[PDB]
Design a protein around this motif. Sequence first.
Motif, PDB file in Angstrom:
ATOM      1  N   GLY A   1      34.055   5.979  -2.942  1.00 46.47           N
ATOM      2  CA  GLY A   1      33.177   6.947  -3.587  1.00 46.47           C
ATOM      3  C   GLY A   1      33.938   8.104  -4.206  1.00 46.47           C
ATOM      4  N   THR A   2      33.282   8.806  -5.135  1.00 48.65           N
ATOM      5  CA  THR A   2      33.887   9.951  -5.822  1.00 48.65           C
ATOM      6  C   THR A   2      33.440  11.273  -5.202  1.00 48.65           C
TER       7      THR A   2
ATOM      8  N   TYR B   1      24.496  13.592  -2.075  1.00 49.65           N
ATOM      9  CA  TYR B   1      24.469  13.859  -3.514  1.00 49.65           C
ATOM     10  C   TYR B   1      23.572  12.859  -4.242  1.00 49.65           C
ATOM     11  N   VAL B   2      23.192  13.195  -5.484  1.00 53.42           N
ATOM     12  CA  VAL B   2      22.335  12.322  -6.293  1.00 53.42           C
ATOM     13  C   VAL B   2      23.196  11.536  -7.293  1.00 53.42           C
ATOM     14  N   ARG B   3      23.418  10.253  -6.982  1.00 51.06           N
ATOM     15  CA  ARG B   3      24.227   9.368  -7.825  1.00 51.06           C
ATOM     16  C   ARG B   3      23.327   8.479  -8.678  1.00 51.06           C
TER      17      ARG B   3
ATOM     18  N   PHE C   1      25.949  14.413  -9.382  1.00 53.67           N
ATOM     19  CA  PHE C   1      25.711  15.846  -9.575  1.00 53.67           C
ATOM     20  C   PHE C   1      25.077  16.490  -8.317  1.00 53.67           C
ATOM     21  N   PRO C   2      25.149  17.857  -8.144  1.00 49.98           N
ATOM     22  CA  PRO C   2      24.558  18.538  -6.980  1.00 49.98           C
ATOM     23  C   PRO C   2      23.065  18.807  -7.139  1.00 49.98           C
ATOM     24  N   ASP C   3      22.316  18.486  -6.079  1.00 49.33           N
ATOM     25  CA  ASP C   3      20.860  18.668  -6.039  1.00 49.33           C
ATOM     26  C   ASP C   3      20.377  18.658  -4.583  1.00 49.33           C
ATOM     27  N   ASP C   4      20.762  17.607  -3.843  1.00 52.83           N
ATOM     28  CA  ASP C   4      20.393  17.454  -2.434  1.00 52.83           C
ATOM     29  C   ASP C   4      21.453  18.085  -1.508  1.00 52.83           C
ATOM     30  N   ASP C   5      22.558  18.563  -2.101  1.00 55.62           N
ATOM     31  CA  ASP C   5      23.644  19.189  -1.343  1.00 55.62           C
ATOM     32  C   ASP C   5      23.484  20.716  -1.318  1.00 55.62           C
TER      33      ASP C   5
END
Length: 25
Positions: free
Chosen positions: A6-7, A12-14, A20-24
Amino acid sequence: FGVRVGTCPSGYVRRGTFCFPDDDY
């Protein structure tokens, strides 16, 4: 034994081949 690739870290929302950040934050 296991294999993980993973990156961005967990929580996170992949979607759309990008992470990108949203759930973090």
